[PDB]
Design a protein around this ligand. Structure first.
Ligand code: GNP
Ligand code: MG
Lengths: 184, 44
């Protein structure tokens, strides 16, 4: 059987509800709040035997503004977010996440996810990056830095064009479903 | 099934949505600029 604990930390959904949510609905270019009503109870067949996990989402609304599980989660597989659009910030994100995710937890793994790659691929937003750089974090780029710290792996995903979604997010939970193997 | 060196268990399959939450905060500030809010907040 084996269970899992979906807990995302960062400035991105990555392993949040946006995956299954947008996958079904809620829209991306609308609003973000109602999601605060997490703790959704589901009933399905999780591979092994009929059972489902519990994705406890943290928020600061009427539901529960006192909650605070993202403080120092003892999880084993964290979720690091990011985006292709980068005006020479890549150096910051790396030196801003690696020392952060480890600060709260003595060396905590993570997983890279792709989504904006669908739009960032455009030459417009890129021009905005050009102001400082222009180099868009390709699906292979995230994989490079991701493996750099033996995190997990960067899979394909898109909440606009649908580049799998479950794929990358499946790699996030995978770390909880059972000890996965790297690629070295 | 999924299959990924882990008992080959299928990730959060379908039909897993019964709806068991309250919340519901109408459009407050929408989402114009990236950089989502930490999981501590989640929504505006
Ligand atoms: N490229 C890329 N984009 C990311 C990544 N993590 C997050 N994002 C971006 O951040 C967005 C997620 O929106 P978010 O507000 O977190 O989702 P949500 O809160 O679950 N939706 P709701 O409104 O129902 O609460 C995605 O559209 C995606 O473009 C990542 O690793 N890579
Ligand atoms: Mg959400």
């Amino acid at each position: 059987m084996q269970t899992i604990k979906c807990v995302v930390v960062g400035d991105g959904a990555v392993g949040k509800t946006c995956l299954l949510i947008s996958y079904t609905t809620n829209k991306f270019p609308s609003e973000y709040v109602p999601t605060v009503f997490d703790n959704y109870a589901v009933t399905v067949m999780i591979g092994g035997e009929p059972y489902t996990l519990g994705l406890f989402d943290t928020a600061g609304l009427e539901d529960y503004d006192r909650l605070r599980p993202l403080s120092y989660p003892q999880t084993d597989v964290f979720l690091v977010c990011f985006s292709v659009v980068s005006p020479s910030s890549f150096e910051n994100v790396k030196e801003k996440w690696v020392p952060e995710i480890t600060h709260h937890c003595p060396k905590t793994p993570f997983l890279l996810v792709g989504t904006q790659i669908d739009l960032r691929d455009d030459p417009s937003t890129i021009e905005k990056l050009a102001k400082n750089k222009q180099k868009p974090i390709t699906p292979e780029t995230a994989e490079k830095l991701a493996r750099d710290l033996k995190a997990v792996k960067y899979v394909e995903c898109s909440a606009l064009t649908q580049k799998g979604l479950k794929n990358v997010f499946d790699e996030a939970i995978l770390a909880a479903l059972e000890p996965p193997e790297p690629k070295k | 099934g999924s299959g990924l060196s882990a008992q080959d268990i299928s990730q959060p399959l379908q039909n897993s949505f019964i709806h068991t939450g309250h919340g519901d905060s109408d459009p407050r500030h929408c989402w114009g600029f990236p950089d989502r809010i930490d999981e501590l907040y989640l929504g505006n």
